[PDB]
Amino acid sequence: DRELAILATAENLLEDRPLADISVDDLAKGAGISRPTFYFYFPSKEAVLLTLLDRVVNQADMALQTLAENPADTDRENMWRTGINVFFETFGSHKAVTRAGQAARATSVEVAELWSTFMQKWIAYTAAVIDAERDRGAAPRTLPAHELATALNLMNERTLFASFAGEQPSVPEARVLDTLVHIWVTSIYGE
Amino acid sequence: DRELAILATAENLLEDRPLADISVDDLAKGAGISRPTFYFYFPSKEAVLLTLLDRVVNQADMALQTLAENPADTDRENMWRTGINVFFETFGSHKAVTRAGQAARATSVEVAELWSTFMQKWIAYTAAVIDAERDRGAAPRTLPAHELATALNLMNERTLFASFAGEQPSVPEARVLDTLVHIWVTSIYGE
Ligand SMILES: CNCc1ccc(N2CCCN(C(=O)CCC3CCCC3)C2)cc1
Ligand SMILES: CNCc1ccc(N2CCCN(C(=O)CCC3CCCC3)C2)cc1
CATH class of the missing domain: 1.10.10.60 (Homeodomain-like)
Structure with missing residues (x-):
């Protein structure tokens, strides 16, 4: 309309x-x-931004949901890569909304609660996957899975943001996905 | 005075x-x-905050410099822990300045350039240590050392900040140091 x-x-x-x-x-x-x-x-105008951000966040959420229900026939490293790629491609396709949305976290209770709710959901899902990998013997029992999942998801939020924004310092956008996958896979599977 | x-x-x-x-x-x-x-x-008042933050940032920088010149007689995991602990203890002892200082990044060019300069320095030093570990055969040649160092330092900035601020989600302050050390050691030494 x-x-x-x-x-x-x-x-x-x-x-x-x-x-x-x-x-x-x-x-x-x-x-x-x-x-x-x-x-x-x-x-x-703040409510306009909140709606834009809500659409981007739910687009990522739904794509991650789709992946969860259709496991790709590939190795473990590529499965994590396909998951992180959801966030890389969704927010990376809406950089201006991502930028303004993170800025509004400081001033808008609704924006801050939107980010927090979806971060909590994604951390919980990450932790459950780590827990499943430990139960089948594919990953060692090192850090508490929910604490590890929290730090890795916070790393992604900060690092993708810096790459998208071209901050100094940042990982170049063409390299950030492989950088994050390496840190996720080594810290989840490494003894 | x-x-x-x-x-x-x-x-x-x-x-x-x-x-x-x-x-x-x-x-x-x-x-x-x-x-x-x-x-x-x-x-x-902004200049007052800039001075407070400059003092906290240089306190951390000098402590890291001191550690570099006095290597502790302990294993590799504990050496990284002692380094990350500098940032954990320095900013963790000045949480209100750390909080206000990160908020001012959005509005103050001088604050944003202070953070960026010292992040660049710490990333470069991290990368040089990783490079030294690879040259002596203690660490595998995986990611480019400077890209790995960038993401790990950005992880620390975001994760320590969330812990200090009690954000939801966050790693509890009493657990965040061991969480970060685990991710640093596995991603630097893991094949
Ligand atoms: C601030 N820049 C946009 C932005 C970019 C990334 C994120 N993220 C933090 C929330 C979940 N996230 C992740 O790293 C989730 C990885 C998926 C979850 C399950 C298997 C792999 C990315 C959040 C925001
Ligand atoms: C935002 N919260 C305060 C704050 C907390 C941590 C940081 N950090 C990012 C800059 C360097 N940093 C690090 O993680 C450096 C680790 C040291 C460097 C060499 C051997 C081990 C912490 C920056 C700010």
């Missing part, structure tokens, strides 16, 4: 400017509506 | 409130001076 035009306008404008440099008038103009009509679809 | 009283006041107030909830008048009062006298020592 007009809602999709507002969202697409916001995502396009976030390529160039921070959210503080975008006005409600800018979003309405880009969507072909008046300022009061905008407020019928969203209560604020 | 009066400068130390301003700094100590700011660090005490940051335990309770964010920097946006602290006024120049608050710092001057706590230091026993007037507002115009404050501006003789610092141009802004």
